Ligand binder design. Structure first.
Ligand SMILES: COc1cccc2nc(Cl)c(C)nc12
Ligand SMILES: [Mg+2]
Ligand SMILES: [Zn+2]
Length: 313
C-alpha cells in the first residue's frame, strides 16, 4: 500500500514543466501517468490494481495511427497535470480525479479521421451521433472500459459522486471538439471582460474546463520547437491520409489535407496559431494566470513558423 511511483531524476524534475515530453519509451508512460495521478490527486484516490488494469485497457483501445494515438493521450494528460499543479487550490477533489482520466480517454478508438470525413463517408457513428461524432464515441468508449470487470476506478465514490465525475468526464471529452472551442472561447472572453465570470457558477466552471481541454489537446504547439516540428509531421500524416480518402470519395480536399500542397504547410500552420492557438492560450492565461508558460511557448513556435516561411529553416 505504502508504494509511491518514482521517476528518474531528470524526469522527476522536468515533468513539472508545461513543455515536458514523455519520450520514446512506451513502457514508461503508464508509470508516468500513475505518478501524475498520485501527485495531482493522492495515493488514496484509486486502487492501484484497478487503475493499472484501466490504463492497459485504455492503451489497448487506442489505435496505431500517426498522431491520435496512446502517446497523444499521455501527453494531453501530462499537460492537464501541469495546469492542475499550478492552480491546485482552484479544483475540487472530483475534478482532479475526472480531468486526468478524461484526458487519458479523450481520443479513445480514434481512427485518424475527422468528423467531416465520417459525415461524408456516411459512417454508422455519424448516424448514431449527429454532432461531435468522434467525441461522443470517445466518451462511449470510456464508459465501456469503466464497466469492464475490475475496471471501475471510481468504485469508492458514492452514487452521486460517481454521477458527478462521469459528467465532468463527459463534458470535458465533448469540449475537445474544436468546432465547439470557438464559441466557448468567445463566451469566456466576454464573461472575463465584463467581470461576470464567477468560478462558483457551474456553467462557468464547465466553460473554463472546456478551455483547459482545448489547451491540453493542442499542447503540441507549447513544447520546444524540435518537438513541435516533429509532432507536426504526425498531425499532417493523418491529414494527408484523410485527404487521400476524400479524393477516393470524389471530393477535392481542403489544402491542409492535400499531400500535393505540402509547400502550403508553414503558411497554414501560421494561420492555425493566429486563429486558434494564440486566442486559446491568451484567454486561458487571462482566466488562469499560472498557465502563462503555455502562451509564452506558443508564441515562440509561431515565431519559428514565420522563420520557416522566410527561408530561415
Ligand atoms: C492547420 O493546422 C491544424 C489544424 C487543425 C488542428 C491542428 N492541431 C494542431 Cl495541435 C496543430 C499543430 N495544427 C492543427
Ligand atoms: Mg478531438
Ligand atoms: Zn486529442
Amino acid at each position: 500500500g505504502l508504494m509511491q511511483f518514482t521517476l528518474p531524476v531528470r524526469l522527476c524534475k522536468e515533468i513539472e514543466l508545461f513543455h515536458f515530453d514523455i519520450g520514446p519509451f512506451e513502457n514508461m508512460w503508464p508509470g508516468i501517468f500513475v505518478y501524475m495521478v498520485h501527485r495531482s490527486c493522492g495515493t488514496s484516490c484509486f486502487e492501484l490494481e484497478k487503475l493499472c488494469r484501466f490504463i492497459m485497457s485504455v492503451k489497448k483501445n487506442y489505435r496505431r495511427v500517426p498522431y491520435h494515438n496512446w502517446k497523444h493521450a499521455v501527453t494531453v494528460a501530462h499537460c492537464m497535470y501541469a495546469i492542475l499543479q499550478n492552480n491546485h487550490t482552484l479544483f475540487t477533489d472530483l475534478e482532479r480525479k475526472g480531468l486526468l482520466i478524461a484526458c487519458l480517454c479523450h481520443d479513445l478508438d480514434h481512427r485518424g479521421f475527422s468528423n467531416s470525413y465520417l459525415q461524408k463517408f456516411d459512417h454508422p457513428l455519424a448516424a448514431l451521433y449527429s454532432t461531435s461524432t468522434m467525441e461522443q464515441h470517445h466518451f462511449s468508449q470510456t464508459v465501456s472500459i469503466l464497466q469492464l470487470e475490475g475496471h471501475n476506478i471510481f468504485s469508492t465514490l458514492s452514487s452521486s459522486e460517481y454521477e458527478q465525475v462521469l459528467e465532468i468526464i463527459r463534458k470535458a471529452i465533448i469540449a475537445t471538439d474544436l468546432a465547439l472551442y470557438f464559441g466557448n472561447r468567445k463566451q469566456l472572453e466576454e464573461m472575463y471582460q465584463t467581470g461576470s465570470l464567477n468560478l462558483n457558477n457551474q456553467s462557468h466552471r464547465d466553460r473554463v474546463i472546456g478551455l483547459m481541454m482545448t489547451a491540453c489537446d493542442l499542447c503540441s504547439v507549447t513544447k520546444l520547437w524540435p518537438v513541435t516540428k516533429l509532432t507536426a509531421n504526425d498531425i499532417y500524416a493523418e491529414f494527408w491520409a484523410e485527404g487521400d480518402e476524400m479524393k477516393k470519395l470524389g471530393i477535392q480536399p481542403i489544402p491542409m489535407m492535400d499531400r500535393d500542397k505540402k509547400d502550403e504547410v508553414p503558411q497554414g500552420q501560421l494561420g492555425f496559431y493566429n486563429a486558434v492557438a494564440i486566442p486559446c492560450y491568451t484567454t486561458l492565461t487571462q482566466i488562469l494566470p499560472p498557465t502563462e508558460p503555455l502562451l509564452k511557448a506558443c508564441r515562440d513556435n509561431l515565431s519559428q513558423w514565420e522563420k520557416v516561411i522566410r527561408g530561415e529553416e
